[PDB]
Amino acid sequence: DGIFRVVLITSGSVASIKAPDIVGALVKSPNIDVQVVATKASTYFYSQEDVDNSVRSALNLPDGQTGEHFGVRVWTDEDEWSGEPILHIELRRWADLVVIAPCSADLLAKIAGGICDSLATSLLRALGPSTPVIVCPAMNTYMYQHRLTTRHLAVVQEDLGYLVSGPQGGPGKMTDWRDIVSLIEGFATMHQD
Amino acid sequence: DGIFRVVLITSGSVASIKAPDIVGALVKSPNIDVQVVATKASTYFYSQEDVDNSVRSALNLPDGQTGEHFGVRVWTDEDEWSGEPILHIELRRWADLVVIAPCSADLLAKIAGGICDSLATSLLRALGPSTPVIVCPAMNTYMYQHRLTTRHLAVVQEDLGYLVSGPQGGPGKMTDWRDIVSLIEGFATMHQD
Amino acid sequence: DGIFRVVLITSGSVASIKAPDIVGALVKSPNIDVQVVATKASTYFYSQEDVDNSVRSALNLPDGQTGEHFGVRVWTDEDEWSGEPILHIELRRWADLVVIAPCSADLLAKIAGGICDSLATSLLRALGPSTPVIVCPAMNTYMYQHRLTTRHLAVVQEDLGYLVSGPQGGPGKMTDWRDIVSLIEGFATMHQD
Numbered sequence A, B, C: 001d002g003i004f005r006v007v008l009i010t011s012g013s014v015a016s017i018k019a020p021d022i023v024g025a026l027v028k029s030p031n032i033d034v035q036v037v038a039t040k041a042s043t044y045f046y047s048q049e050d051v052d053n054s055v056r057s058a059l060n061l062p063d064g065q066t067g068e069h070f071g072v073r074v075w076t077d078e079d080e081w082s083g084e085p086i087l088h089i090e091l092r093r094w095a096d097l098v099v100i101a102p103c104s105a106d107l108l109a110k111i112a113g114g115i116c117d118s119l120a121t122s123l124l125r126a127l128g129p130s131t132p133v134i135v136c137p138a139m140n141t142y143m144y145q146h147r148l149t150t151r152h153l154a155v156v157q158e159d160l161g162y163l164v165s166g167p168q169g170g171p172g173k174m175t176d177w178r179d180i181v182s183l184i185e186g187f188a189t190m191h192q193d
């Protein structure tokens, strides 16, 4: 199987506006598939149709509507509560890589705290050490400079083994989404073996 | 007063399906009363009528409907927000024992974190050292193997003095509900003095 | 500019009933303005009209209705999600002082945990060290005596530099609201320079 599978977790940062650009780039990438997990807050910054528009844009398709979304569904907490398979378990099995872009201060704090009362955090909590995780913090600079940020980055890094694509240095802006994609393709390369 | 009073806290684990069997067993037990606190997630795995059906089953009653629930009401967060007495305070006073079965990873993390934005966690936070607590973790094995699980079990055990009926060793399955009940009856025995 | 600006954060403690008395006192105070941030739980203990009634009472105004609220709006989480300015950022810039009165055990735990999934906690997380913070814990005495309370007060104090107007010694009752106001006026004095 020559397919690399990425789960993109988007959280309640303004940088979630670039989530459709990332998905569009991953779709167009030949041997990479992408599934998206959106926290409730992140859904305020983009819609499913933004993603669909973004996929068509990247694939040089004319406008129109679907439907099956090419097929890249944006999963939310609601989907999980509707012997049957459990969604965050299915996503854990599927994923070869988990990318949190953007990662808000809240999600960072929740991850460091081990709290898992959403699809996104249940997925991360359920992961096996098989699956690598890339965290891209994205927040107001005064949120990033907060004392608890570095303590949570520490927990997330040393304890959990997550990789931090730390924000651009007013430090706090997310790593540019194009850089995110090429980081992802670098892992796809590793995986192809 | 020869009555032993148990508050059962059920959380969002699949093992919550066995919560009605526990309640049915505690009701039938001669000198034990039970009250139930359900987190919102746990209410997805069983209903009030499951409990009622389970009580009738244990008490050899024919089917029918109530009403007063024998009277074992499943308390939820909603009830608490409807000089008046505060529910989680009333439950703390009432309880001789608090049993968390099942305890999800989320609830474990919330307890260890001291977060109390629900009936269940407000009750635990408000307890006096008079009242013992039994925690029965129940989660996907990769959630239990997560690094933060053991750190939270440590906080819950050493700091809070909670007793952990640790999961069955794929470690993560809840202690069998029949074992839970007999653990409970062992405390009832202690209490009878 | 001879105006001192206070943001009052009210949380889900019964002491939130005195929040309108505080606002009324701050409004009447000549060189002090007040804005209010209410957690969802705190909105159960008082309404906007309680505040308005309380302002009229303090300003010797006859009853009637508004409208513009004099103008002291009680901000909630809902307002924040309705290039545009972000509310908790605007409030951070505005505030010369942040007062958490009352501070529940939950909010204390969330602050210590760095969790910021509400207007109140996003505001606190986004603050600059320029702005001082006064925390007034207010909870059931058994919640205050809980082991995690002192650990959170420690984090909040040493790590974050927040000032704790610790509860009255059954320790747990909030510092009397009149004492809160005069503490606030003491900071206004400092600020006037």
Ligand SMILES: Cc1cc2nc3c(=O)[nH]c(=O)nc-3n(C[C@H](O)[C@H](O)[C@H](O)COP(=O)(O)O)c2cc1C
Binding pocket: A011, A012, A013, A014, A015, A039, A040, A041, A042, A103, A104, A105, A106, A107, A138, A139, A140, A143, C080, C081, C086, C087, C116, C117, C118, C122
């Ligand atoms: C308009 C707006 C923009 C926000 N931008 C950010 C941000 O860039 N980074 C961040 O950490 N939080 C930001 N927040 C705060 C989070 O959205 C808020 O804490 C949210 O509840 C976190 O939810 P989450 O854990 O799903 O990300 C913003 C909030 C609003 C209302």
Ligand SMILES: Cc1cc2nc3c(=O)[nH]c(=O)nc-3n(C[C@H](O)[C@H](O)[C@H](O)COP(=O)(O)O)c2cc1C
Binding pocket: A080, A081, A086, A087, A116, A117, A118, A122, B011, B012, B013, B014, B015, B039, B040, B041, B042, B103, B104, B105, B106, B107, B138, B139, B140, B143
């Ligand atoms: C179908 C389904 C089954 C789940 N089973 C478990 C479980 O067995 N153990 C666990 O820790 N979490 C489990 N979860 C995740 C929790 O339900 C989720 O984290 C929830 O928000 C926790 O809420 P709580 O703190 O009230 O338990 C499950 C989720 C779903 C959707």
Ligand SMILES: Cc1cc2nc3c(=O)[nH]c(=O)nc-3n(C[C@H](O)[C@H](O)[C@H](O)COP(=O)(O)O)c2cc1C
Binding pocket: B080, B081, B086, B087, B116, B117, B118, B122, C011, C012, C013, C014, C015, C039, C040, C041, C042, C103, C104, C105, C106, C107, C138, C139, C140, C143
């Ligand atoms: C009637 C009632 C009164 C409460 N009083 C207090 C209190 O005085 N102090 C406290 O810490 N929690 C109290 N609680 C519990 C909190 O309201 C609950 O934990 C809430 O979810 C916390 O939300 P918050 O973080 O916005 O304050 C009370 C709850 C109820 C239902």
